[PDB]
């Protein structure tokens, strides 16, 4: 599947320029939204929006570029088309065959660090996931903390779910995990 | 139903004083691929991704050539002005819990970088290591800054300390981050 790009339009001591086209999907392909940004220094000066209809200068430093590109049909009409030729295309194209359909099994492990039961869940590719702490069959839900999914960077996640409960020999705490890969809730236990 | 994905298709960056450029594609914050402006080929973060989808590298060099132009114009239209340098922020950690003996990867996060010009290297005990050291392209931050991730695979131990030294113009002196299994 070939993916297509956004196409930066022409303009009428360190310096850094930036351009990027963004495709905001929601519900999958239900509602699409396209946006581009032309960023000079660190100030985004020119922008396009899938909901406004044409280019609009976000700052006065880009009045020129904004006017001109909305005068010429070829430009204005082209950009307004990327919603389909870039967003929808890519989605149904490459994504729906690569990013999207890629699952990863989580590696759940309990441990300790005057103590807090930690339940580290790692290396999974589904944003969503449910981690529930259980006691001797009862679902604890009071001293339960979380640490914000950390994007590892290699398309895997890592999160930590704490628990206060100072453990007393005899009880069995169990870490519960939901579909970040399968449909058989993984369950790590810790006796003693 | 509702709420889902986001894809940046077409991140084009470019610095004038050094003629440095970078082209990348990210989906959901993760980097799909980046185009190599020298070797003129598309490179995939995840190799099993190329065997399914693809990208015309030339479609990258073009946006570099278009942004190069605009850089130039926009420098003249603001009467030539600097951009204050920022102070990068390292944060080291492991990819998986540390289980002595079992190979693991070590991640050196480096948020808030600007301009996109930085040297990140690793140090075992004190000596600089070179094997198993991976690094990503610059990812973008909603405040138009950049963050880069540098990896290092290792074998967890009791007798050793790792470090991630970060060099940047926004630092008169490098500031290695310290990390031990402790």
């Amino acid at each position, epitope marked *: 599947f*070939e993916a*297509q790009k956004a*196409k930066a339009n*022409k303009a009428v001591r360190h310096f850094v320029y930036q351009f990027m086209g963004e495709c905001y999907f929601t519900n999958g392909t239900q509602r699409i939204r396209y946006v581009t940004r032309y960023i000079y220094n660190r100030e985004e000066y020119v922008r396009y929006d899938s909901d406004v209809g044409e280019h609009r200068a976000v700052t006065e430093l880009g009045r020129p570029d904004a006017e001109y590109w909305n005068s010429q049909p*070829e430009i204005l*009409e*082209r950009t307004r*088309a990327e919603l*389909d*030729t870039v967003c929808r*295309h890519n989605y149904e*194209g490459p994504e729906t065959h690569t990013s999207l359909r890629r699952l990863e099994q989580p590696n759940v492990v309990i441990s300790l660090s005057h103590n807090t039961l930690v339940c580290s869940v790692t290396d999974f590719y589904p944003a969503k996931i449910k981690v529930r702490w259980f006691r001797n069959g009862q679902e604890e839900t009071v001293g339960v903390s979380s640490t914000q999914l950390i994007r590892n960077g290699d398309w895997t996640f890592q999160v930590l779910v704490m628990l206060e409960m100072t453990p007393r020999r005899g009880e069995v705490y169990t870490c519960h995990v939901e579909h970040p890969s399968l449909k058989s809730p993984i369950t790590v236990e810790w006796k003693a | 139903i509702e709420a889902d994905h986001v894809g940046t298709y077409g991140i084009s960056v470019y610095q004038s004083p050094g003629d440095i450029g970078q082209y990348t594609f990210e989906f959901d914050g993760d980097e799909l691929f980046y185009v190599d402006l020298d070797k003129k080929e598309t490179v995939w973060m995840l190799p099993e991704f190329g065997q399914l989808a693809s990208f*015309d590298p*030339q*479609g990258g*060099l*073009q946006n570099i*050539a*278009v942004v*190069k*132009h605009n850089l130039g114009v926009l420098t003249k239209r603001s009467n030539s002005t600097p951009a204050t340098n920022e102070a990068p922020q390292a944060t080291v950690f492991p990819k998986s819990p540390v289980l002595l003996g079992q190979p693991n990867t070590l991640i050196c996060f480096v948020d808030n970088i600007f301009p996109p010009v930085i040297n990140i290297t690793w140090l075992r005990n004190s000596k600089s290591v070179a094997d198993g050291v991976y690094e990503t392209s610059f990812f973008v931050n909603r405040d138009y800054s950049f963050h880069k991730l540098s990896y290092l695979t290792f074998i967890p131990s009791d007798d050793d300390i790792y470090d991630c030294k970060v060099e940047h113009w926004g630092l008169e002196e490098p500031v290695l981050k310290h990390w031990e299994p402790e």
Partner: T-cell receptor, first 108, second 111 residues
């Protein structure tokens, strides 16, 4: 990654309708233009089209684009004898690709 | 508009032929085509800007240059009979809009 122009050479009487067919394979082409080159000099642009069938321009020419089939053709209604020129269909994304060309000849 | 230099040229196999192409627009892109009968227009080289230059369809045998942003020159090191034809030099904007061609150039190569 290359376009196909079939009618190598074509001939039709005045007033008649000439049809020149093209077919491509790549799917990043978001611009399909047509160039006419008179037997005298350099080629020029005639009519182009972007994804979404039908084109009016210079009411005499019409472009039928079929994305589902990745086929498009150029129709010339009431073909005059002066519209005899080699016709090149093209497909563009990063750059342009042309076809074999069709040498049209409208017999007077 | 654009204007090709040698609008006509005859050479022997092994000669160093050089074609020029002065542009006079604010176009950054410049392409060097090559027309023949049965094949039509085929791209040999093109450049997105001065100092830039990309190969095209049949770049073999050639090697172009882009010294300024208003001049793109195609260059034949070792001419060959297989290089006889008409060469066109176009100018244009990025993302494909309309390429503006040149008058043309006829080149012939013989032993």
């Amino acid at each position: 990654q290359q376009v196909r122009q079939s009618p190598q050479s074509l001939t039709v009487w005045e007033g008649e309708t000439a049809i020149l067919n093209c077919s491509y394979e790549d799917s990043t082409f978001d611009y399909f233009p047509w160039y006419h080159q008179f037997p005298g000099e350099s080629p020029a642009l005639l009519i182009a089209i972007r994804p979404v069938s039908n084109k009016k321009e210079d009411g005499r020419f019409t472009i039928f684009f079929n994305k589902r089939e990745k086929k498009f053709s150029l129709h010339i209604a009431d073909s005059q004898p002066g519209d005899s020129a080699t016709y090149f269909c093209a497909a563009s994304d990063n750059r342009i690709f042309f076809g074999d060309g069709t040498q049209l000849v409208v017999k007077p | 508009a654009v204007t090709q230099s040698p609008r006509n040229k005859v050479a022997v196999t092994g000669g160093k032929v050089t074609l020029s192409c002065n542009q006079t627009n604010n176009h950054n892109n410049m392409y060097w085509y090559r027309q023949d009968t049965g094949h039509g227009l085929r791209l040999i080289h093109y450049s997105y800007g001065a100092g830039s230059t990309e190969k095209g369809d049949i770049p073999d045998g050639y090697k172009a240059s882009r010294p300024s942003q208003e001049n793109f020159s195609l260059i034949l090191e070792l001419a060959t009979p297989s290089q006889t034809s008409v060469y066109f030099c176009a100018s244009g904007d990025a993302w494909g809009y309309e390429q503006y061609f040149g008058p043309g150039t006829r080149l012939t190569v013989l032993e």
